[PDB]
Every structure is written in C-alpha cells, then in structure tokens.
Amino acid sequence: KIEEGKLVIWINGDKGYNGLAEVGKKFEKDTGIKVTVEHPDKLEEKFPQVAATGDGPDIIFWAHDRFGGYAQSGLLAEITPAAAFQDKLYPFTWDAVRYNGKLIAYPIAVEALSLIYNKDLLPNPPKTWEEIPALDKELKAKGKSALMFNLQEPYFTWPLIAADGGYAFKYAAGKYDIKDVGVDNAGAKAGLTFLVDLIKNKHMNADTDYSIAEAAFNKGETAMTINGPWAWSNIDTSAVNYGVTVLPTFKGQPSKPFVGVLSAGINAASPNKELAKEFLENYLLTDEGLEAVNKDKPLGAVALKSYEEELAKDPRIAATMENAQKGEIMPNIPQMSAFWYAVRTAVINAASGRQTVDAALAAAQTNAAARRCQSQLERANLRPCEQHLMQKIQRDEDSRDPYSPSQDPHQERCCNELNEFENNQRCMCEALQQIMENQSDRLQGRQQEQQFKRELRNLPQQCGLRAPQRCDLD
Amino acid sequence: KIEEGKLVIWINGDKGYNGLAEVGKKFEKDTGIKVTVEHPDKLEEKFPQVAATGDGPDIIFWAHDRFGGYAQSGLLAEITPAAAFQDKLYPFTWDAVRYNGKLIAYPIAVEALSLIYNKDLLPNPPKTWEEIPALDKELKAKGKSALMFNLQEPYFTWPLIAADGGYAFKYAAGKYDIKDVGVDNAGAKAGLTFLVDLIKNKHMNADTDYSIAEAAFNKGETAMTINGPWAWSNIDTSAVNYGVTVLPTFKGQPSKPFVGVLSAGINAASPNKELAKEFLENYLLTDEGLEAVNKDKPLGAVALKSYEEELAKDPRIAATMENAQKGEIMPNIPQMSAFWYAVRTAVINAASGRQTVDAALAAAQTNAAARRCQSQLERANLRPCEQHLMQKIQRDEDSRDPYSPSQDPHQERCCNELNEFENNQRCMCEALQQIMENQSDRLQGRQQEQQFKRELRNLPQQCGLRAPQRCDLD
Numbered sequence: 036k037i038e039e040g041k042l043v044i045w046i047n048g049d050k051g052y053n054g055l056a057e058v059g060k061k062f063e064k065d066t067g068i069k070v071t072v073e074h075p076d077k078l079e080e081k082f083p084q085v086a087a088t089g090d091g092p093d094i095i096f097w098a099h100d101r102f103g104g105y106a107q108s109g110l111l112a113e114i115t116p117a118a119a120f121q122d123k124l125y126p127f128t129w130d131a132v133r134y135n136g137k138l139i140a141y142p143i144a145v146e147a148l149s150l151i152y153n154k155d156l157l158p159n160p161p162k163t164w165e166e167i168p169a170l171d172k173e174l175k176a177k178g179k180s181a182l183m184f185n186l187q188e189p190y191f192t193w194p195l196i197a198a199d200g201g202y203a204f205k206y207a208a209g210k211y212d213i214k215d216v217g218v219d220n221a222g223a224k225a226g227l228t229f230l231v232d233l234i235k236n237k238h239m240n241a242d243t244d245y246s247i248a249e250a251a252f253n254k255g256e257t258a259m260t261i262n263g264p265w266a267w268s269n270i271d272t273s274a275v276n277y278g279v280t281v282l283p284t285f286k287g288q289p290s291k292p293f294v295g296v297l298s299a300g301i302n303a304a305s306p307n308k309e310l311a312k313e314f315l316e317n318y319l320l321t322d323e324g325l326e327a328v329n330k331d332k333p334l335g336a337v338a339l340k341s342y343e344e345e346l347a348k349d350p351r352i353a354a355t356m357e358n359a360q361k362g363e364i365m366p367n368i369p370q371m372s373a374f375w376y377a378v379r380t381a382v383i384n385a386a387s388g389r390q391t392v393d394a395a396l397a398a399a400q401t402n403a404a405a406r407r408c409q410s411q412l413e414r415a416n417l418r419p420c421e422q423h424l425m426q427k428i429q430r431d432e433d434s435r436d437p438y439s440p441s442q443d444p445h446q447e448r449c450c451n452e453l454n455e456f457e458n459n460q461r462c463m464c465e466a467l468q469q470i471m472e473n474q475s476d477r478l479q480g481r482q483q484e485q486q487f488k489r490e491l492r493n494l495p496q497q498c499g500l501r502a503p504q505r506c507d508l509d
Numbered sequence: 510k511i512e513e514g515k516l517v518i519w520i521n522g523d524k525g526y527n528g529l530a531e532v533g534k535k536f537e538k539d540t541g542i543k544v545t546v547e548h549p550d551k552l553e554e555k556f557p558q559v560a561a562t563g564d565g566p567d568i569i570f571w572a573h574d575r576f577g578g579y580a581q582s583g584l585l586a587e588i589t590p591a592a593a594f595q596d597k598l599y600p601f602t603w604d605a606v607r608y609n610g611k612l613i614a615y616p617i618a619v620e621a622l623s624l625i626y627n628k629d630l631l632p633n634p635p636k637t638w639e640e641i642p643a644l645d646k647e648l649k650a651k652g653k654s655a656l657m658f659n660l661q662e663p664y665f666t667w668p669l670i671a672a673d674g675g676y677a678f679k680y681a682a683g684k685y686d687i688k689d690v691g692v693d694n695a696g697a698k699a700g701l702t703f704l705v706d707l708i709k710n711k712h713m714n715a716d717t718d719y720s721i722a723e724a725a726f727n728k729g730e731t732a733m734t735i736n737g738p739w740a741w742s743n744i745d746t747s748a749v750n751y752g753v754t755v756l757p758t759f760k761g762q763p764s765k766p767f768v769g770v771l772s773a774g775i776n777a778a779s780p781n782k783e784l785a786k787e788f789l790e791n792y793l794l795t796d797e798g799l800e801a802v803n804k805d806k807p808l809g810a811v812a813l814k815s816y817e818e819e820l821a822k823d824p825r826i827a828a829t830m831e832n833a834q835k836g837e838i839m840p841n842i843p844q845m846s847a848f849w850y851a852v853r854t855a856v857i858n859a860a861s862g863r864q865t866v867d868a869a870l871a872a873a874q875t876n877a878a879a880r881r882c883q884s885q886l887e888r889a890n891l892r893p894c895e896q897h898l899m900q901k902i903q904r905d906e907d908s909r910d911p912y913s914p915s916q917d918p919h920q921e922r923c924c925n926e927l928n929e930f931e932n933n934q935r936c937m938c939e940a941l942q943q944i945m946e947n948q949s950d951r952l953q954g955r956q957q958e959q960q961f962k963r964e965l966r967n968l969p970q971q972c973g974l975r976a977p978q979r980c981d982l983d
C-alpha cells in the first residue's frame with residue numbers, strides 16, 4: 036500500500052524533477068516529512084494500473100488531458116482551494132483541471148510547442164511549411180538538414196495536422212461529441228499528407244524520434260526542431276545559439292498545437308491528502324517553488340500569476356504563448372487516451388508507408404470514436420440488475436424452461452443499463468461478471484448461486500440485447 | 510432441386526388452398542402442366558431456408574410484409590407485367606409488392622381484421638374497448654363470454670396497441686427509420702395495458718390461441734372475436750348468425766389494424782418463371798380464378814378491379830375496408846420479421862405475466878431496432894476486402910511481426926464495409942469467414958492461404974474496428 040507520513044511524487048522524465056526534489060527538501064526541512072520524487076517509464080499508464088489497487092504515489096504529475104480518465108475511475112481525490120489561493124492562479128488553468136464541475140488536480144504551467152531554430156544555420160526561420168523543402172535542399176548541400184522533430188508521438192505532428200481543419204472531438208453545446216471526430220477531414224489529410232511528402236522526399240526520416248531529434252539539433256546538425264519549454268535547458272547547455280518562434284503556417288493557416296496544462300493530482304487512495312495539498316499549495320505553487328523547478332527545466336507559462344508576471348518577460352515564453360493562442364487546449368475527457376493512441380498509430384503507419392494517409396486517418400476516426408469497455412463499466416450502475424435478479428429468484432421458488440421439478444407444478448432500469456454494452460459482447464460479458472462478483476458473497480445457498488448464473492446469463496436476451504458467445508462466471 | 514415442367518405452390522393453411530388447386534387444374538386442363546398446391550407449417554420460415562439452396566416451390570404465397578426480406582436475400586425473381594395488366598390491379602396493391610423500385614411479387618387481395626359478433630348473443634356490438642369489461646361481466650352471468658381472439662400472434666393484438674399512438678417504424682422522408690420504433694410509447698403501453706387488464710380480470714385468457722377462439726365463437730360460446738376474411742367460411746358453416754363490423758375504439762381512437770396484402774412471388778431459382786407468370790396473370794388474377802379461391806375462403810378486397818367491383822357489394826368487405834382505412838399498410842422491409850418476433854414476445858410475456866407491460870415493450874423496442882447479422886451480410890459487398898488482402902500479400906513477399914525470415918531483411922473502401930459489423934463481433938467473424946470462403950479456391954499455395962488467414966484476422970484492427978474473440982477460418 037501507500038506509507039502514511041512520506042510523500043511519493045511521480046513526474047515525467049522530461050520535466051524538472053531535480054528542481055522539484057529541492058522543493059521536496061525545503062518542504063522536509065520545514066516539516067520533517069520525507070518527499071520522494073520519481074520518474075518511472077509510462078507513468079501515465081502505470082498510475083491507472085497501480086492507483087487502482089490502492090498503491091502508487093501520493094501525487095501524480097502529467098498534462099491535464101489524462102486526468103479526466105483518472106477521475107472517472109475514481110483514482111483522483113478532489114482538490115479544494117480557499118477562494119484566495121484560486122485567485123492566484125489563472126482562470127484558464129483552473130478550467131483544465133475541472134471535470135464534471137469538480138477540481139481534480141492542481142494546475143502548474145501552460146505548455147505549447149514552438150519552432151526552434153539555429154541562428155547560426157538559419158538567421159531567418161521560415162514562415163511556412165511549404166518553404167521547408169527548398170531549405171532542406173539548400174541545407175543538405177552544406178551537409179546539414181532543415182528540420183528534425185519527434186515523429187513517434189502525435190503531440191508533435193498534430194500542430195500541422197490541425198492547421199487546415201483537423202480536430203479531435205467537436206465541442207457541441209458545452210460538451211464534446213465523441214462521435215464527431217475530425218482527424219479524417221480534408222484538412223487533416225492535407226496536413227498529414229504534406230508531412231509524409233516531406234519524408235518521401237528525403238527531407239526527414241519516419242524513424243526520427245525525440246532523442247534523435249534533440250541530439251541532432253543540440254549538436255548543430257539540423258536547422259530546426261519542434262519542441263516544448265522543457266527542452267530549453269539541454270539547448271542552453273549545447274553551445275548552439277537558438278531562437279524560439281511561432282510555428283510555420285500551412286496552407287496559410289497557423290499550426291495549431293494542442294495546448295496542455297501540466298497538472299498535479301492527488302491519489303484518491305493516499306493517506307497523506309493534507310500533506311499533499313499543503314505541499315502543492317504552500318511550496319510548489321510559490322514563486323520560489325516554481326522557480327526551483329523552472330531552473331531544472333523550464334515550465335512554460337506557469338499557472339501562478341505572480342511568477343508568470345516575471346517569466347512573461349522571456350521572449351521564449353512569449354513565443355510559447357503565441358503558439359498556445361493559435362492552438363487549442365486539449366480536452367481532458369476519458370476518451371482522449373483513445374484519441375491519442377488512434378492518431379499515434381495513423382501517423383506512424385502513414386509515415387512508415389504501411390498505409391496511406393486517407394486509409395490510416397480513416398481508421399483513426401473510426402477507432403477514436405469507439406467507446407472502450409473499461410469506460411462503460413466504470414460508468415455503469417449495475418445495482419438495478421442485481422436487485423432484479425435476486426427478486427426474480429424468490430418468485431421462481433414455486434411457479435417455460437423450469438430449473439427444478441419444483442418450478443414445474445426494476446427490469447427496465449436494469450436493461451436501460453445493459454443497453455450500453457449492446458455493441459461489444461466481450462464487454463456485455465464483463466458487465467455480467469461484475470454483477471456476479473458483486474453478489475457471490477450475498478448468496479447463501481448454492482441452488483441459489485447457479486439459479487442466479489443461469490438467470491444472469493439470459494438477462495441480455497430478456498432486454499432484447501445481444502449476448503456473448505461464451506462467458507465464464509467464476 | 511426444382512423440377513422443370515410442374516408448378517409447385519406454397520400458401521398458408523388458413524387460406525383457400527383448395528380453391529386455388531381448382532385454378533391449378535383448370536390451368537392443367539388447358540396447359541398439361543401439373544400444378545401442385547401445398548400448405549406446410551411455418552412456410553414463411555421454411556421458404557427462406559429452402560429457396561436459399563435452390564429448392565422450394567415455384568410460387569410463394571404470403572402477406573407482402575415478408576417479401577422485402579426474401580428480396581434482399583435474392584430469393585425472389587422480379588415480376589414485370591405489361592402496363593395493361595397492371596392497370597387492372599389497384600395502385601395501392603402494386604405499391605405493397607414494390608421493393609427498391611422493383612416489383613417482387615403479385616398482389617392478390619387486401620386483408621384487414623374486423624370485429625365479428627354473434628347477433629344472437631349481442632345484437633348491438635360495442636363501440637369501445639372500454640365497454641367490454643361490463644359486457645363480459647353481464648355475459649359471464651348467462652354462461653358465455655364477451656370476447657375471444659388469438660393472443661399468441663401480435664397481428665391480432667396490434668390494432669389495440671396501435672390505437673393510441675403505437676407504431677412500428679416511423680416513415681421519415683420516403684423511408685423507414687428502423688431506429689425509430691414506436692412500440693414503447695405512451696400509446697402502445699396504454700393499449701397493451703388495457704389488454705393485460707382484461708386478462709387480469711378474468712375477461713379473457715392469456716393462453717387463448719387461434720383455434721381455441723375460432724371454436725369458441727363458432728360454437729356460440731363467446732359474443733365476439735377478431736379475425737380476417739379467411740375465417741368467414743368456417744362461420745358460414747357454423748349456424749351462428751354473425752355480423753362483421755368496425756373494431757372498437759380505444760381512448761377515443763379507432764383500432765388500427767396492420768393492413769396486409771396477400772402476395773404471390775416467384776422463386777428466383779425456379780426454371781418455370783414463364784409458367785408461373787402465366788398462371789398468376791392469366792388464371793389466378795382473373796374473375797373466375799379469384800372467385801374459385803374466394804369460394805374456398807374469402808380473400809378480402811381482391812387486388813383485381815373488376816372482381817372487387819363485385820365483392821365490394823358485400824357488407825363484410827365494406828367493414829373490412831373500413832377497418833383497413835383506419836389502419837396502416839405493413840412495411841415490407843427486411844426488418845419487419847424482427848419487429849414481429851419482438852412484439853410477439855412482449856405481448857406473450859406481458860399477457861402471461863412473466864413481465865410487465867413497460868418492461869416487455871421496452872425490450873421489444875430495443876430488439877426490433879437491432880440490426881441482424883444475416884441482413885448485414887447480404888448487404889455487404891466484401892470484394893474490396895478480398896482485393897485488398899490479396900495485393901497486400903504480394904507486397905509482403907519481400908519487405909513488424911514478420912511472417913517468415915524472408916519478410917525480415919482499397920483499404921479504406923474495405924474498412925468502410927467492415928464498419929457495418931462494429932456492434933456485433935460474432936457477425937464480424939462471419940464477415941471474415943465469408944471473405945475466406947470467397948477466396949480459398951483462388952489461393953494457389955498454402956504459405957499463401959495461411960498468410961492470408963493471419964492478415965484477414967487482424968483486418969478489423971487495421972480498420973480501427975472491434976474483432977471477435979474467437980473465429981474459425983476453416
């Protein structure tokens with residue numbers, strides 16, 4: 036489980052975790068509470084998996100977009116700041132940690148990608164994506180290349196995709212229509228197409244990932260890269276003289292980065308909820324705290340109004356905010372992970388040539404708009420079905436297809452719930468399994484239990500719904 | 510298979526099949542072609558099952574509503590009458606055998622249910638359903654009952670259900686919205702409710718079926734029944750003095766029978782298509798022909814204008830047409846069978862008390878609006894998927910998760926088709942099986958075949974679609 040007394044903190048390996056450990060120590064010098072800071076791999080995946088059972092860190096750091104999922108799963112303890120404190124952080128940033136009218140994490144900083152150029156290799160950076168092929172040609176001559184960024188992650192290639200019309204889920208009347216996915220429209224295609232063409236023409240390489248691009252840029256091998264504030268430190272170390280400017284335009288429109296807001300959320304299974312709140316509110320979210328971290332690795336435009344008033348002077352932050360405004364805040368809904376995985380795949384297959392732009396995006400659209408089982412299960416309230424089945428058993432203890440020689444002398448609300456598993460039978464099964472589990476202990480007899488299994492088994496048919504071929508009800 | 514030279518005809522056991530055999534003989538006396546007339550059980554089920562392989566009758570008789578399904582399955586040969594002939598039959602009736610802008614059967618007669626009363630027991634039949642409980646009470650005293658009709662079939666109980674708002678599929682802009690099902694609205698509930706209440710109060714019995722009601726009425730045991738023209742003969746035999754009148758009203762509206770049009774369709778696998786056409790056009794659809802049949806058992810309002818001009822004089826036919834007009838023509842779409850099965854179930858469970866009106870209807874709505882696998886398969890054009898997979902194999906004969914040490918140095922349109930099986934995985938499987946079958950013969954090698962199976966197997970995943978847990982590709 037989770038030790039009471041200490042604070043364990045998870046944050047991604049590309050963030051200023053050393054800078055955060057310092058705030059960990061200042062907090063310890065004043066508190067005596069041991070603050071541990073870790074940067075595991077795939078922590079945004081691991082957390083859902085571990086916080087579920089009741090383990091993991093007290094605090095979890097990631098971009099706001101994943102927290103909706105965590106919330107829906109009941110993994111995040113709600114956070115509640117006295118009005119005053121809230122007045123210190125930008126409205127904009129508070130919204131990003133708001134799910135179902137609740138605050139589920141603490142905002143830290145606003146992130147957005149910008150175009151980063153080597154002032155040596157390229158005094159004047161291009162205004163347009165279209166300009167780039169010419170450049171690379173020119174640069175290849177001098178033994179260099181025009182541009183290199185991470186292609187393995189959608190986050191990076193999305194600003195171009197989004198430029199001429201691409202979007203994730205439309206925002207219709209105060210909500211996201213997760214059936215209205217715009218990754219397969221003219222714009223998205225145009226964008227991804229241009230991207231692939233760059234590859235087809237030897238201007239960049241489908242296999243290029245983060246570290247490869249970072250190294251290339253930091254060793255002065257390519258004129259341009261695309262990245263976020265976090266990456267500024269390593270360059271500051273690298274002897275390269277760099278500028279940070281607005282991303283190029285495509286078909287005349289600005290690239291539109293998915294703006295994300297670094298957030299800190301408290302494990303809803305942690306004993307140290309108070310300590311956590313005090314840490315984040317009184318130490319991290321302070322001018323010294325943020326600075327300590329921002330020193331290790333730049334946060335972008337911090338959530339706290341006072342320190343940002345300082346940071347704003349930095350031209351790099353200006354360009355960061357410029358790109359951010361051209362962009363859109365990522366949604367934080369549960370379906371976002373689906374969307375991301377979907378697009379990650381499309382981009383890769385298209386980039387690698389396994390598929391065509393039109394095909395890959397078409398698959399992404401289909402898949403990103405498909406509801407996942409785990410989500411549906413969490414949202415399910417299966418009690419009505421439980422109650423129904425129990426009752427039905429009493430009325431069959433003395434009254435077609437009878438169970439025993441003795442049988443041979445709520446339903447709506449339940450079915451309403453099961454309706455949600457009508458398009459995924461494996462899922463329908465899981466829902467039945469969940470029902471079983473939630474009752475096995477309340478089942479006295481055994482005639483009782485198996486006369487429950489069989490009833491449970493043809494429950495979907497009773498609702499006029501589709502049913503699994505097989506379904507183990509251990 | 511089907512013998513060339515003879516004509517085999519299927520018609521339901523409750524129709525004037527003897528009367529039709531006569532036209533069978535007059536046709537034989539003039540032709541020498543042996544005409545066989547049979548009335549098998551569940552012939553509307555058997556036919557789809559047998560006509561599929563290429564057997565069955567040359568001609569198939571049923572209400573128009575089932576023929577849409579037969580058509581979609583390619584079981585019905587299109588029928589084409591010279592304008593003149595068509596001018597002999599009512600427009601209304603031609604529409605009923607029209608599917609996808611094609612004539613798929615020959616209209617014979619218009620059917621509709623009416624209220625049939627014993628003039629001895631009840632000189633003045635009720636205007637309203639509401640009046641009936643009082644009657645039955647009064648009649649039970651005299652040792653009789655007010656009303657008895659078939660409860661095992663939805664066809665009979667639907668006029669009441671439909672009365673105050675019930676419908677099958679809404680007709681939206683020239684088409685039926687099979688997702689807009691009106692069997693679970695206030696009206697339908699009201700209607701079914703009244704019906705169940707009749708039962709709950711000992712006014713009728715949930716177990717009452719056709720023969721039980723017919724016998725009861727024909728032996729003068731109940732004052733009223735609800736039935737169609739076909740039933741007139743047996744009563745004519747029965748010494749009971751009966752009238753045929755408009756069905757009672759419910760909540761102030763007329764009962765609304767599903768008007769059906771007896772149709773004759775030609776097996777699209779029969780060699781005798783010409784004979785069939787000549788039989789139906791030149792013998793059956795004539796004043797003598799129809800009469801011969803109408804003699805055995807009344808057809809209702811026949812499709813042929815001339816004979817109906819005669820029949821119209823019969824007050825019984827008048828009442829039949831009155832009820833028909835208060836009613837609605839059944840749709841002939843493939844989904845109709847689903848709808849009927851769904852409602853048959855609801856009615857029975859509600860009537861039997863296994864479920865409540867609200868629950869049962871709610872299940873019917875859900876289920877009647879659910880697309881069936883066989884339908885989706887028929888409508889599927891899986892070629893694109895076939896072509897795609899074949900090609901993909903060539904491009905893998907020398908180029909992640911490789912098949913052989915050698916591999917280790919259309920898609921959209923296809924997926925568009927597979928999208929249709931996204932809510933039924935068993936079905937997705939069948940679609941893959943169909944693809945396999947349609948290629949096993951075109952597959953030279955064996956490395957070829959199994960390198961096809963594996964590709965085929967993760968085809969849904971390539972389309973971002975859901976996939977079966979298991980799928981045998983024999």
Ligand SMILES: OC[C@H]1O[C@H](O[C@H]2[C@H](O)[C@@H](O)[C@@H](O[C@H]3[C@H](O)[C@@H](O)[C@@H](O)O[C@@H]3CO)O[C@@H]2CO)[C@H](O)[C@@H](O)[C@@H]1O
Pocket residue numbers: 047049079080097098099100101146187188189190191263295372375376379
């Ligand atoms: O590619 C598959 C992948 O998608 C998911 O990651 C996304 C995040 O949810 C999202 O916040 C963003 O990640 C970036 C941050 O905003 C930023 O601080 C910095 O770390 O760069 C990040 C990108 O590498 O975008 C990504 C998608 O690219 C998802 O959460 C994962 O589970 C998954 O493996």
Ligand SMILES: OC[C@H]1O[C@H](O[C@H]2[C@H](O)[C@@H](O)[C@@H](O[C@H]3[C@H](O)[C@@H](O)[C@@H](O)O[C@@H]3CO)O[C@@H]2CO)[C@H](O)[C@@H](O)[C@@H]1O
Pocket residue numbers: 521523553554571572573574575620661662663664665737769846849850853
């Ligand atoms: O109840 C289950 C059942 O539904 C289907 O039968 C329907 C028919 O499609 C339909 O034409 C109608 O059947 C009647 C005729 O119109 C009439 O000529 C006479 O025969 O009375 C009939 C009713 O018994 O209504 C029924 C539904 O009640 C379906 O086709 C069957 O497969 C099925 O078993």
Ligand SMILES: [Cl-]
Pocket residue numbers: 074075076
């Ligand atoms: Cl690790």
Ligand SMILES: [Cl-]
Pocket residue numbers: 111112113303
């Ligand atoms: Cl909480």
Ligand SMILES: [Cl-]
Pocket residue numbers: 116117118119
């Ligand atoms: Cl307060």
Ligand SMILES: [Cl-]
Pocket residue numbers: 202203204205363366
């Ligand atoms: Cl969006």
Ligand SMILES: [Cl-]
Pocket residue numbers: 220221222
């Ligand atoms: Cl478009």
Ligand SMILES: [Cl-]
Pocket residue numbers: 548549550
């Ligand atoms: Cl038989």
Ligand SMILES: [Cl-]
Pocket residue numbers: 585586587777
């Ligand atoms: Cl044909």
Ligand SMILES: [Cl-]
Pocket residue numbers: 590591592593
């Ligand atoms: Cl003609």
Ligand SMILES: [Cl-]
Pocket residue numbers: 676677678679837840
């Ligand atoms: Cl209708």
Ligand SMILES: [Cl-]
Pocket residue numbers: 694695696
């Ligand atoms: Cl309603």
